[PDB]
Amino acid sequence: RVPLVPKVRRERKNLSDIRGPSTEATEFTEGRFAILALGGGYLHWGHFEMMRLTINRSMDPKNMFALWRVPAPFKPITRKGMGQRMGGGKGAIDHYVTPVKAGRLIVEMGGRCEFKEVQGFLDLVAHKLPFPAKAVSXXXXXXXXXXXXXXXXX
Amino acid sequence: SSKNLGGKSPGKRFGIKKMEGHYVHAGNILATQRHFRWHPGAHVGLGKNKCLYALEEGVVRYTKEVYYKTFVHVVP
RNA sequence: UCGGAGUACAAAAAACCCUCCGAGUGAUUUUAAUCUAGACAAACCAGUCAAAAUAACCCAUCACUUAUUGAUCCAAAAUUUUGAUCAACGGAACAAGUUACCCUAGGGAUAACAGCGCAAUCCUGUUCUAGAGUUCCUAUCGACAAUAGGGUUUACGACCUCGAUGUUGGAUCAGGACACCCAAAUGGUGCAGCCGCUAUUAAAGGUUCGUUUGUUCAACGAUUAAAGUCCUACGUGAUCUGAGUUCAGACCGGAGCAAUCCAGGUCGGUUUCUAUCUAUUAUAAAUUUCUCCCAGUACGAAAGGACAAGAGAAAUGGGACCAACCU
RNA sequence: UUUACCAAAAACAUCACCUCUAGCAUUACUAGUAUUAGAGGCAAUGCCUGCCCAGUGACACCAGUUUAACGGCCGCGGUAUUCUGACCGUGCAAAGGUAGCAUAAUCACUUGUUCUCCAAAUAAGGACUUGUAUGAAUGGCCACACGAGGGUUUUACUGUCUCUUACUUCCAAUCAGUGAAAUUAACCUUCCCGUGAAGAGGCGGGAAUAAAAAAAUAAGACGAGAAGACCCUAUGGAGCUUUAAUUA
RNA sequence: GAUUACCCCUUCUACCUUUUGCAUAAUGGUUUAACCAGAAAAAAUCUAACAAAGAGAACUUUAGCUAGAUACCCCGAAACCAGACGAGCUACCCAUGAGCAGUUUAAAAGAACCAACUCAUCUAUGUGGCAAAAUAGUGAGAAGACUUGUAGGUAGAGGUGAAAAGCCUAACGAGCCUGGUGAUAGCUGGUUGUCCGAGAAAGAAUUUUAGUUCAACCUUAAAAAUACCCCAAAAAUUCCAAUGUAUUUUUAAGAGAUAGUCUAAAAAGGUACAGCUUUUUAGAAACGGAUACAACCUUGACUAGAGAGUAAAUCUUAAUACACAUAAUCCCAAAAAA
């Protein structure tokens, strides 16, 4: 998965995606189980692709479907040549990353409901990410949000 | 090292020189703008640079109208 | 030099060897005649809007909307304007190199060597467990990622130093770190045994002699219980060495019309100091190896083949001595 | 013969070879006359010095001549087990390196490969040639003899070394006489861990310590000594060279 | 400061210069004495004379004119030019003299070796020396292009040079002396008594970045104004009531400054590196606190006083699974979990 026409100039680093806690993609929708982000960070294309390979090799034979809410990275990464100096124009683009805020759903999976497989797999995925991943279901997310609001009200 | 090239352009200081409620004089510059942000009202002339000015002595007043135009008037 | 769109979120302005596009004009039709207020912008100088009066009639479209130029003195078609790519664009009317033969004024406000800050790069301990290992994730490996340590590599920054911190290597003299090469104590082993592999604990001692080339290396010879790594201004020139390199010559090759250069290869090239202060001018108890004996038994088809205990020799080294040998 | 005072060398000079300019007089040349004089390159001698005059220079005059004048002397494709290309085709140029030589005072890759030398040879010698980047008078290839030049291998002999030891003399040491020097802000002058413009005897906290010399060791006082000779700055200076511009 | 007619203990990081910042291991100083570096009035402010006139036959003048009194320091080159002095050093040459054993050898001033003499190959010593070119061992030439005495010639918009950018009186990419000359230096090193008030770190340009010219500020002496903190009418601000304030300019002269940093926030570059660079906003620079230490925390800065009340701060809080290199602890020792 690569950008069709990367003629667009490299984008500056806003850092607002790291700071901002967007609740936009937190909507659970049809997915019974999902992955949540506990911190802001840039998700490499290799991370996402190898996560796709991870969910493909771990695919449940009976019933499973993989849905990724995270789109292909629109943000390139700029790096100067090794051993060079500062300035003298921008460097070369190594690869692309997707800005990820707090609360955004990384991966949602359709299928039958089993806690044993889901929790474990999403834990493995949690070990495969630079930021802590939270395996989420409707009841657990609603109970955690209600407990956090009730603990903030006290 | 840098292939791309561009220059810097000194500001012409576009904006509004006078405010509503202020007492101005005839021939005084009201608002210097690019194209039309606002439109000239009664007793207010229009320039080639699209800069509104006061025709006669009076007080500046801003009034919005929707038929979406913004008029500046001078009340003697 | 200039114009527009972001960086530069709801009046201005605001940088970087930040980021996108545009100009030194192109064309079609009507034509901008005299001067009175009053404002915007503005360090200087250059730029915008314009009621209203008079004489005579009754500027405008495209190149998204704006850009699209030049201040003095000096020349000319003629008595009023036309000329500089003065583009290094606020503009010395008119001009290119070299100096390792160099000199002076200066600067650590500014480079190279070392230190320091940083840890991309460099090295290494780990986290997750897909996939190899016939079977078996983790004896031995770790797709892809994640958390760190270290300050030996290559760089960044230019913080002390250019009224000087002398930059490689070798010799000499050491000290320290442990990520242990060897000797020691162990775990696991796809560990029968002997030898290995992997990991843990441990820096007390030791860690050789040569050939080629300046090596930092590397290849090779002979041993050894092993021939560890790094730091100490990549230790050590007021101890030495000048082999490398840092400057006066002689050639090859390349570049240049030439003066001459090259982070290229061959030869040669005097290295100054009498110690003022601080510091220093030893008590000791060790350390390493080989050989022999039990033995060629247990074990094993065969090949193969100890732990312990005992004995005799050296070695390095500490502290010594001159009776013999030797100078 | 040459940098008197860091270079004595392959450099310069030297006999010799060649090119080219001078037919002329009484304080150079020279009281000389083409076998003479000036200029240039090369450098005994031995074997040779092939091609190119389009450009520059030079000579006869607009055209041509002239390489021991300044200089220059190619690429691609195809063809027989493998490989290679005597041969052929083609582009370009004024003409495309002939003899000889060659990992060389030249070769980047490189410590080319092979052989000799050594128990081991990035050096050395002898060969091979895809010569990055040899070449025939800035000469080419060899050469007896010669060299305080630059390299390599056996023998002989040695305190060079394994590995140092002893002795003699002049200093160092003592006493007496005569009595310096650079250096020096003032100095009551310890160490460690940290900090401080980032390397502290003067700061902090711990450790150590009665007060003063002499003979010795050179770690520190970023020791002493030279207003860095590298780097950069200044609308600094000077030497040298030109098709920089401007001209007695 | 205490303390005894002396000392130990407690309280403190030389001066100066240069700098964003120096006790700094950045600069200068052995000490002392002495010597030693702000001398120019146009316009202006001010004190006086007279006043539509002043001023000693000259100028100004819609209150001027005249006079007096007030602000702009030194040292230093490398080099250039002119006039001369220099070949008793050395380089070459002219004239006139002198010197260079011995041995093997075929005729051979012929070859080779080797003393004098002429050179300075290598090593060592010497390194404010014996000596501002040495001594010891060793080595080259040594009848030749040799060495040397004396008398002469050639000099700097040059001479000479068996040619090294060498020599020309101990340092020659162009000698030395004197003069131009107190050459030029935007640089660097310097610039001396007391007290009081106020008190600066960046707008555009420049054959410009280590320098200048007016703005952004500031100071002196007078006048006329008003100005800010600024809510709703309106377009983080741009404006304006009211508030409690004091100032904001106008004019007249006169300065200096324009090679700065860090933290906090928002950005850009760099690697979600840097005591990193490039911007915006804010703060910043006793001797209290942070062990010491530029900004962090507390505080705005009279002298004197054997008074008092406080600000910040100081010693501690967080845990469980039937790896660098000299001597330690993140400032002593310990402690505990108002």
B 1-40 residues with CB < 8 A to A: 1-3
Q: List the CATH number of the domain containing B52.
A: 2.40.50.100
Q: Which residues in A31-91 belong to E strands, given as ranges?
A: 33-37, 41-44, 64-67, 75-79
- Chain A residues near residue B2 by CB distance under 8 angstroms: 88-89
> At CB < 8 A and 24+ separation, what contacts does A84-88 make?
A88/B1, A88/B2
A127 is in an annotated binding site: yes
Query: How many Cα atoms sit within 13 Å of A22 on the Cβ side?
Result: 12
Q: Which residue of B has its CA nearest to A89?
A: B2
Domain count, chain B: 1
Task: Please count the other Cβ atoms lying within 10 Å of the Cβ belonging to residue A15.
Answer: 10
Query: Which neighbouring-strand residues pair with A114?
Result: none
CA–CA separation, A74 and A92 (whole Å): 16
Q: Give Cα A18 to chain centroid, integer Å.
A: 12
Q: Diameter of chain B by CA atoms?
A: 62
Beta carbons of B3 and A89 less than 8 Å apart: yes
- Domain, as residue range, for B33: 1-76
Name the residue among A82, A67, A83 with its Cα closest to residue A35: A67
Q: What is the resolution of this structure in A?
A: 4.9
Classify each residue of A69-87 as buried b or exposed e, where b means 16 or more C-beta atoms within 10 Å of its C-beta.
ebeebebbbeeeeeeeeee
What is the residue-wise DSSP string for B9-76? ------EESS-TT-EE-TT-EEEE-SS-SSEE-TTEE--TT--EEESSSEEEEEEEE---EEEEEEE-
